[PDB]
Design a protein around this ligand. Structure first.
Ligand code: CA
Length: 278
């Protein structure tokens, strides 16, 4: 398949080079896979989801996304126009309030939920979790993200937007998950993007067009935008049978575009997510 005039991030992960506008992908598009979007929620009624999005859990008064962050990241995972895996199933786990903030205990509980809730869902091609959140270091949050990963869920987490080493941020510093940094449309590390030895992959994260609450769309920047790219790419690759949840992060690094990014500090991976579609 080919999407003409695609968001630059979608075209980027389907090309060996920057500057292209067409998103090439296999028509399977991640059908049969599930991606849990643990964030502010998902506006499931958004036409771009085509009924493939549902809210499964909320830790606040309402399951509605009053912020728009989670609907945006869920759109980057599997929206029709703005999604990597355009036929995946999207599950919304609202752990952040409508301010985009959330206590660590709630975030841990949200990850514990996805580890159990997945086994009462039909996801024959695997389960992915996209987590565009995080604060300072916390071994309890790292342990939770590791539990979700070990339960059989491909966990993609954001490296953080502090322009610092991700070693001091959770769940970014949990080694067993997929820590995702951000790159811009000219293959530079995003100005804000965290780095460090714990990063496993870089995704498009600067000015990412995706869906928004109110049936709308808008472009925002952050490692929060690069995470759903990798989460969608993993579900796309697991539907193709090229990898499993336990190995999708290692596979994406094995087949990533190597050495293309700039302002990557020494000791940080120069790998950009790539679907190798031909
Ligand atoms: Ca890792």
């Amino acid at each position: 398949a080919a999407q003409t005039n695609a968001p630059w991030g979608l075209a980027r992960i389907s090309s060996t080079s920057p500057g292209t506008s067409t998103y090439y992908y296999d028509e399977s598009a991640g059908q049969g896979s599930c991606v849990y979007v643990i964030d502010t929620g998902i506006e499931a009624s958004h036409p771009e989801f085509e009924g493939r999005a549902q809210m499964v859990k909320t830790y606040y008064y309402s399951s509605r996304d009053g912020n728009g962050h989670g609907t945006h990241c869920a759109g980057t995972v599997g929206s029709r126009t703005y999604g990597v895996a355009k036929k995946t199933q999207l599950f919304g786990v609202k752990v952040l309030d409508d301010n985009g903030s959330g206590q660590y205990s709630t975030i841990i509980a949200g990850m514990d939920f996805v580890a159990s809730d997945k086994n009462n869902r039909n996801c024959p091609k695997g389960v992915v979790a996209s987590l565009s959140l995080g604060g300072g270091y916390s071994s309890s949050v790292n342990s939770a993200a590791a539990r979700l990963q070990s339960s059989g869920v491909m966990v993609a987490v954001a490296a953080g937007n502090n322009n610092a080493d991700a070693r001091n941020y959770s769940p970014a510093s949990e080694p067993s998950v997929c820590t995702v940094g951000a790159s811009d449309r000219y293959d530079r590390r995003s100005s804000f993007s965290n780095y460090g030895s714990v990063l496993d992959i870089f995704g498009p994260g600067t000015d990412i067009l995706s869906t928004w609450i109110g049936g709308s769309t808008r472009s925002i920047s952050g490692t929060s935008m690069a995470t759903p790219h990798v989460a969608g790419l993993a579900a796309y690759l697991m539907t193709l049978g090229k990898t499993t949840a336990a190995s999708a992060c290692r596979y994406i690094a094995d087949t990533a575009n190597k050495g293309d990014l700039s302002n990557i500090p020494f000791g940080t991976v120069n790998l950009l997510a790539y679907n190798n579609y031909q």
